[model samples]
Target chain A: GITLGEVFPNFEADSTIGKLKFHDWLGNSWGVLFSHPRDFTPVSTTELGRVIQLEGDFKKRGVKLIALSCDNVADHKEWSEDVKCLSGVKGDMPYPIIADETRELAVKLGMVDPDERTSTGMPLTCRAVFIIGPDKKLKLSILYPATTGRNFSEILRVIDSLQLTAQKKVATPADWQPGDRCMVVPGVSAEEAKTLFPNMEVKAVPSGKGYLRYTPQPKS
Target chain B: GITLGEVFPNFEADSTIGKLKFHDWLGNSWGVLFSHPRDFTPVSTTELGRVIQLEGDFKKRGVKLIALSCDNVADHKEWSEDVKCLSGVKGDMPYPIIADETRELAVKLGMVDPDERTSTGMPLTCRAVFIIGPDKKLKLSILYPATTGRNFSEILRVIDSLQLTAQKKVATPADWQPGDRCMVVPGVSAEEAKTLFPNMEVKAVPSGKGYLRYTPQP
Candidate 1:
């Protein structure tokens, strides 16, 4: 429900591990909060496994991974075991999964699916992912249908791009990985570019616009 | 504003080249409609250039690429030349860019930035991207602030995953590229997986759950 640039609401919920207050758990780090529609679903299981494999990726980036579902804590605990069994790694679930049995968390986040519901009329949640910055504001939000799994790789790639662009005026080019040349943002002048980027390359164009400038990827 | 699984509204608008309609131009191919805040911006030029470089990628995936900006046709025409030049590729702007001067498209799509505006009070548009399937329905949507240039590579990568998973039950894993082994969705039983993936390998885990299986780049 919340849009970009808005501070992510801090809330408390019962998780598989225990009760958790979101902000307290986050502890001044970038956070990724992803929600699933149900527990023990094959798609959700594999999604958790995908996250398990990327623990190192999140750790290196100082990102905290938290998962949520509408299931109860008992069910979450049971399902987490299945997640561990399904994952190639031999360890704990690696992250805490919130159990929103009352559906308050799902409704508050606007993740409820109207058409798809349980026999009790509780709406199923979609695959909603929220990336929170260190300032506690929502940086990006992605929602996927229950059938399609979320691409964590794309999530990490966006984090890389977000972190890079946040610190510098330059933006990454298409399909850019780390270390690729970055484009100088338009506001910077040619005179300023020389001082800013000592070795910047300006491509000549027919329009006589000197804005098409490229520089080696910035260091810190 | 609209999420996935919804039909994108069809509208006609003036473009840099000429007048155009949305669905009629899309035909039976997949489509990507990306928006920029203004014309002649440095970030937008490179974004367009990124698309030009991946023309073959779009063609190979049977996708049609179209761009949109709030500026009029004249400005779009002039800015397009810069896009062509800024791009490493040489030639005319290969794709049609819609000149939504009236901001009708931006307003309808909820891409208007209330906090940012021009001297005329017209709301600035964010970097909004809509990926439409062959069925003309919204498949994916990504909105970035104007300050950040859109990642066209991530867009293509999502298309790869979406297209592959649409036909198969298996889902691509994290950081998965093409030719990587895909995870078997839980819907498939051990018996079904054997038939689906003849060479599937089940990882030997302590729990002995067969769901932790893998195949050679399935």
Candidate 2:
């Protein structure tokens, strides 16, 4: 359960892909570590399948996806079959689904749902997504309860905003898409922004401050 | 902060709505406690304005919205003018902006962004939104760094899913809209499911486990 701007800790665990090490597998790619409640559940079926369906989108963004559950490795692989069937892809999962059978990793990631319990009373994982930058530092997070399956589209949106803002000297505005205008960070002086953004348009607000500057999306 | 399902801790703070009490003000309505980096910032201006524009959508859902920042009440009041101008609304903010000047509430709520600091070397609040249920328990959270402004549409989507799932014996699927079919929870017995959701559709997967069931988003 790392906070924003903190380095995600490294750990080795059982996975659909055998004997996986966390940071090593990530390599230079930006990463997403998301958790589901358990395997074979209907929500997990659709959710994991949705990820595979959007594999290319994540791939194009240079983001690697990994999933975690409290279930075992055997269950994880067995569940992949149903996941593929549900997802309409008859093959291996596009990404590894880690088996934190002991819930150690789940607890560490702040993924365990305090109220959701197994028959044995152990806490289950919630819909937790941790977006990691290439630096392996946590960027953004969306934590939902188990009942609410997440929209990968929103996750993709977060990545786009995070990656774009990090690369440029600008920040994204509300509901900003990739092609939309970006707000110039206050640190960028007027002269510097003029040079950096040739088409920048500074809006005149009632505050009469020059801080409300907008520029066309900068190319990386 | 609040971990999901945990009761959001209570604190009274200075606000644009004058001194506000945390729980009493919320009453029985569901609430959103979101924090911006600071007042008079470009991202926060548009972000808070968007919330004002969508106030009716949230209000119809019986949800009250509140905002937080590290600045004082005076600054919060002053910043509302710019937010109003940007949002094209001539009235006051549809919600209260809490002033956590000492950041006591911010740190308690885990809203501080460690890497983002003011020129005075103080950490600013990140884009943290905590969706609280009527029971005052944290239902969902989206924590973004200071640079990336959040999408209110997504937050509304989360609210819809949470409210719908809580009201029915169903769970929403990915990219699920209000009218999309929902997955029936495994807890519902086959016999009982027929009664609860008369129009349930059970899909046949390769495993043939009978677990991947869909009901008309009941």
Candidate 3:
């Protein structure tokens, strides 16, 4: 359902990145690309530091990280190292951050907010995260005020849930995870389920009050 | 540029709520209302339970909590009691929750997502949290995916940060708390700052390396 036409136009002017089309990098491995207003500001700087701290979490879930700004590559390189020093992160960054100086990427990706700007007159990117999937489709997005730092653990958990849902076809209830029991599709009756799922532990007799444990049944 | 038009929408269905708006019987306190898709599922239930388990954290911040879904209010009522029992949360729940069966509030809040629905053909509300200020203006919002449990500590931190920011002209750094050093607005330079902020440690510096450690002028 996602088209690449609007995706790559953002990266058109990024001459340094030859083969890294936005969608190409997101191929199969889920990706989260975020945009900050600038590079060296105190708030934006600490956020990058948090990303570095959470690199292992990203690695575990096969998710790549991208941080960009309207500033050029030189700014990104300088700021990246500065963040490393100030945040006391273990090492250099583990991801490829884009240099979107032209505002092309900002416009295409819908990152920059013209209405909200720092008093210094620079347009702000209101701290947004676009969670893209292997299918190159935008899955989830979080847009918060710049004063707030993102929840890194939650982002990874979301990717894990998305991957699980993609494979399982069932929507997770409120706070689902790997081993938790999933919800029963609303309409499936107990009698129908018993005929279909002989292994199901039907509770409360006729009602759908049973724990339908995971099992292998013939594909419908 | 925060305006009344943007703020008043939070109170639209208020008349219908009448006395029910303050139904919880809690004397007076602020509230944090969060919502997810459904119950008995992995992500939503875990988060719901997590909110209860972290009841002390909510109490510490002087905040209340409410979680919602399209599930029946009776279901939420049942689950609230169940969560209280299972999690062993001490004392009565610090807040009351609502079951948005018709999704009136969810639709108004722009939390529901048709595109995000599963193959089962049921549209659901995404995760959303509204931090209502004492003045009743919504101060902060944190929305996440259903898979993730929100950081209760961070929510409290942001509340502190927002309240601080609104009171003083100074801006908070990323993930900043109340006590964290704040940014010195660029307008007041080192020389001028000494006059305005008699106690600040002002150093004449440019953009990125602007005024160093500035203690609030007590």
Candidate 4:
């Protein structure tokens, strides 16, 4: 039940890297915690592998990648090898996989689906992805059904957009990629935008409105 | 308060296209409803323009684009000129802009942010975007502050991923685009995968686990 602009609560759990508290582990960096329904499943394996592939990209952004598995650390350890084998990753997974077997974190994080239950009456966890800012607030969340695998690439793109907009007074446009022109926020006045984006281009319009200012992507 | 897989409640509203019910207007296609704080603002102007540009793209995918301005129909009609001029989009916006002055639909859809209110105690509507499927259920929801503009391009990307996965047992990979290799759902067995992805390439792994699949992004 967490809302936007609200701080994400911290907790501790057994991870592949050892026991660690979420907030303390995050320190001053951004964090991404994605959940899998269970370990050893084909989609989960591929999902973990995809995350492993992005270890460098994530580190570059000062974002730590952590995963939550419905099972325990024992299963995660066994699953790690499959992740490596399946992802063609030759080394250990750079990130930790939390053992959420108790569903303690699951229930609190609003990830457990009561309607989707197992034969044993356990609620199945959906594919939920959360992006936490350095300030520890929930920046964005995306949920997927157990049947559909998430798009990690899109998640990264969102992170890019969030980080960029957070620092600047502009927003990315539709299908915007890095180096694409960004829109100067409407709140900024013409004089303010002039100084904010010295090289900003003002689009000519019949209405003489000043909000459609466009500028080159700011350097990260 | 509706969650994924739950039906989005239908409501009647005054719109630029005149009065129409939600479900009836949606017909058999997908729908996107983006709510703006108010009309004529710079961000809303740019946001509406972005949607107007994608009219072709949305129609191609059997999706209809509808917008909600916190103000009334009168304001929306006046702002349409600004949207067209600002976006360099010629003529009127092909889509309808709902006049949610009553906040009836906004309150029901959880678009209003109580924590942020005006002097009159009216909760300001956030930049809430909802993607509703043909089944009339909510597929995805994203909210942004009034200061931040919504990304219509990313919205389309999600729609692409959602539609593709709904049809086949495959999911798009990180930063996936159309024509890109997709991940075959684990539910599909090797025998099934062979028939499903006849040209699929399986990567060689040391663990001999059949699940570490890499069939050209199946």
Which stretches of model 1 miss by more than 4 angstroms?
A21-24, A85-92, A101-123, A146-151, A189-195, B110-122, B187-218
Worst 10 residues of 1 chain B by lDDT: B204-213
Clashes of each: 0, 2, 11, 5
Model 3 interface DockQ: 0.20
In terms of TM-score, which candidate is stronger, 2 or 3? 2
Off by over 4 Å in 2: none
Candidate 2 lDDT, B1-218, residue by residue in tens: 46888888878888888888888889898999999888888999999999999999999999999999999898888778889999987786799999988979878877788567789988789999999988988999888888999989988988999899888889898888898999998888999987998999899887779889888865
Docking quality category of candidate 2 according to DockQ thresholds: medium
Q: Which ten residues in a row have the lowest lDDT in candidate 1 chain A?
A: A110-119
What are the runs in model 4 whose C-alpha is more than 4 Å off? A112-121, A190-207, A215-220, B86-91, B102-122, B144-153, B180-183, B188-209, B212-218
lDDT of 4 by residue, B30-129 (tens): 9998887767565677778878888888889888999886677887887788888766667767899888777777777766642345557776676778
What docking grade applies to model 4? acceptable
Of candidate 2 chain A, the 10-residue stretch with the lowest lDDT total is A107-116
State TM-scores per candidate.
Answer: 0.83, 0.98, 0.68, 0.83
Model 3 reaches what TM-score against the true structure? 0.68
Candidate 2 clashing pairs, residues 3+ apart or interchain:
A1-A108, A1-A109
TM-score of the A chain in candidate 2: the value is: 0.96
**lDDT for each residue of candidate 1 in B1-218, tens digit (9 for 90 to 100):** 66566678888998876888888889898999988877766677878888998889998998899999888888888878888776778877778989887888887775764334676878777787888888888776776766556668777877887788778877665445688777676667878877898887666544445565565554
Chain B only, TM-score of each candidate = 0.91, 0.97, 0.74, 0.91
Across residues A1-220, which tens digit of lDDT does each residue of candidate 4 receive?
4555668888989988899988999988889988877776656776788888888888888888889967878878877887877666688789888888788887777676423455587866767788888989877776665545666766777778878887887877554666778878766777887678899887665566555678888886
TM-score of chain A of 1: 0.92
- Could you tell me the TM-score of candidate 2? 0.98
User: What ordering of candidates by DockQ runs from best to worst?
Assistant: 2, 4, 1, 3
